[PDB]
Amino acid sequence: SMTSHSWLCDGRLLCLHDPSNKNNWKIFRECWKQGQPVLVSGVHKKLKSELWKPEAFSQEFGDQDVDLVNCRNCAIISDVKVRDFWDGFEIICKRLRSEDGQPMVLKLKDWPPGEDFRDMMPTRFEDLMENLPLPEYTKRDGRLNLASRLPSYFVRPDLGPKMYNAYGLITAEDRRVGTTNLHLDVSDAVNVMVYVGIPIGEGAHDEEVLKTIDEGDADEVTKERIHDHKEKPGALWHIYAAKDAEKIRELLRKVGEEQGQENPPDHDPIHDQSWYLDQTLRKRLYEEYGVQGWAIVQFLGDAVFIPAGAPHQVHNLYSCIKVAEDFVSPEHVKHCFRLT
Ligand SMILES: [Cl-]
Ligand SMILES: [Cl-]
Ligand SMILES: [Cl-]
Ligand SMILES: [Cl-]
């Protein structure tokens, strides 16, 4: 039976089922005021699927110059064509190879660049912005988005949206690597999974994905969306409450010191964007500092809401196209204030 919502993370995470339901705000706002993330499923059913394919991005924009990141070692591949990324998105025999002769796991950096999404891709911009869930919060001029209404005493977000494109992590060694390392944002964000590419060539890569979700601490209900509904899983997130950010800095300064880093006692390991919390570090955070997070699997068409100030990291299971919009809710405006 169709239902308005359900719970993940053993009741700690709201999952809304109908992205365009005019009554969603009634269920959302209680959870949001407490500093919790929220998941909304089904956004892919609202979109024009032909606008969000890797082959279309390659055909239309393939001659642009871009930099890539090697996710395994953080090395930068400078000044290549954007088709060199897109044509290896699903077909492994077309990926750029490292020295060892293996195909690389690549992230496309800052594309489209800065604030240029709307000018470069007007039809994509319209399709996304007209179908975002919780539109009073998430649209540029929504009644509950303060972004356009605040003075310079507040850090204001850039004009969006921002696209996040990267291959899936593959091997057992890759389990400990991030697609996007642990960081925080002073604005709220909504992050939509618009495409998941499950490859061919080294296709049959199903079993390392299940060990990653299990060791990642995913709940039993999330393990059912795979085995029962056959939905496409994109990315594993870990999100932490804004109130736990300083305890996470204390753990990472202790671990940086153990690993022979020489950092001043006040340096900020979250702002540095240099860490990925693997199974070992997530257990140490819980046991030694008393901090629990939310482990979230983002499937095709899932919208993740990330509260301002909340530390979070992202690990792609398969090749992903994500599109994210920043906003400033009244519930979390304290996090972008420039005084006290
Ligand atoms: Cl808060
Ligand atoms: Cl377009
Ligand atoms: Cl709303
Ligand atoms: Cl990163």
Ligand SMILES: [Mn+2]
């Ligand atoms: Mn972020």
